[PDB]
Copies of this chain bind each other. A is one copy, B any other.
Amino acid sequence: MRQCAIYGKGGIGKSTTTQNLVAALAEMGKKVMIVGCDPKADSTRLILHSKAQNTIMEMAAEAGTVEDLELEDVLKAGYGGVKCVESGGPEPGVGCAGRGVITAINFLEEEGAYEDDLDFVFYDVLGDVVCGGFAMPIRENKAQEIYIVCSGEMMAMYAANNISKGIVKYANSGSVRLGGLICNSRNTDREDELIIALANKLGTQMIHFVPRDNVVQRAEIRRMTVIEYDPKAKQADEYRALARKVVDNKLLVIPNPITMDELEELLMEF
């Protein structure tokens, strides 16, 4: 079982790429579980065809405790038998994103979710704040292979660099590695070269450049992946290519985060 996480800042299509990647993996007959850890995205919407899956935190509140919850309530099968669960974001103003994630992981462990013939687990994690709360899947030794979704944009590359700093902290004392950068295209001048340059400075790879395509939005609107919406689409082959490279990936490194001076010089050059 390969224990993976996708990190990246919000507003650049990270969860869309995660779900289209996972759909592409299921299409190859890989048994995949998605654990949603992102309060700014619906991590399972495009797999389950559901506007917002009920979260572990929500249904522990509704039933009043977590030992009363049944796995059937929490873990739902969608496209290609992909198993979907949502941790549930922090209680507004009071909670920590880490509480939902710890609760989800402990519940899935207890209930046997991790020994049920899985090829991949993907934690879909928000990278807007690189705090201990959003590090929970790594802290719990539940994600060893990290892929970072970024774009040729200052804040997406800053987030990629800061996520890399977090990986080094848990890699100085354990098993977590960076598997690569995924570039979600923003239809930008030679954008691929910018993310390749960043990958080269970090000591990783740009594992795929995901193009901008109308078909992604068209599929999103119908609450599905491009893989399911339009399987013969050119964009469907883009996610298949990414999925094939993840499956075959051996390049799992301790990254070399860069200085703000280095990042600024990169951005100014491009």
Residues of A within 8 A of B (CB): 9-11, 39-40, 51-52, 89-97, 126, 128-133, 135, 138, 155, 158-159, 162-163, 165-170, 260, 264
Tell me which residues across on chain B come within 8 A of A91, comparing CB atoms.
169
Known: A40-B155, A260-B52. A92 touches B10 (CB 8 A): no
Query: In the complex, are the beta carbons of B133 and A93 less than 8 A apart?
Result: no
CB distance from A25 to the nearest CB of B (A): 26
Take A40-B155, A155-B11 as given contacts and tell me if A93 and B126 are in contact as well, using a CB distance cutoff of 8 Å. Answer: no
Q: Chain B nearest CB: distance from A153 CB in Å?
A: 9
Are A132 and B95 also in contact (CB < 8 A) when A155-B40, A260-B52 are?
Answer: yes
Q: Which residue of chain B lies nearest to A164 when distances are taken between CB atoms in the complex?
A: B92
- Verify B130–A93 contact, CB threshold 8 A: yes
Count of chain copies:
2
Cα–Cα, bound, A155→B9 (Å): 13
Chain B residues within 8 Å of A169, by CB: 91-94
Residue of B nearest to A159 (CB): B40
A-B residue pairs in contact (CB < 8 Å), sample of 9: A9-B40, A40-B158, A52-B260, A90-B129, A93-B165, A93-B166, A93-B169, A96-B133, A129-B129
Q: Which of B131, B135, B166 contacts A133 (CB 8 A)?
A: B131
Closest residue of chain B to A131, judged by CB?
Answer: B90
Expressed in whole angstroms, the Cα–Cα distance for A159 and B41 within the complex equals: 12
- Determine whether the beta carbon of A132 is less than 8 Å from that of B90: yes
Contact A129–B39 (Cβ < 8 Å): yes
| With contact pairs A131-B97, A155-B11 given, residues A92 and B162 touching in the complex (Cβ less than 8 Å) | yes
Write the nearest CB–CB distance from A90 to chain B, whole angstroms: 4
Q: Which residues of the other chain, B, contact A131 by a CB distance below 8 angstroms?
A: 90, 93, 95-97, 133
Which B residues lie within 8 Å of A40 (CB)?
A: 9, 128-129, 155, 158-159
Which of A11, A51, A131, A167 has the largest number of chain B CB atoms within 10 A? A131
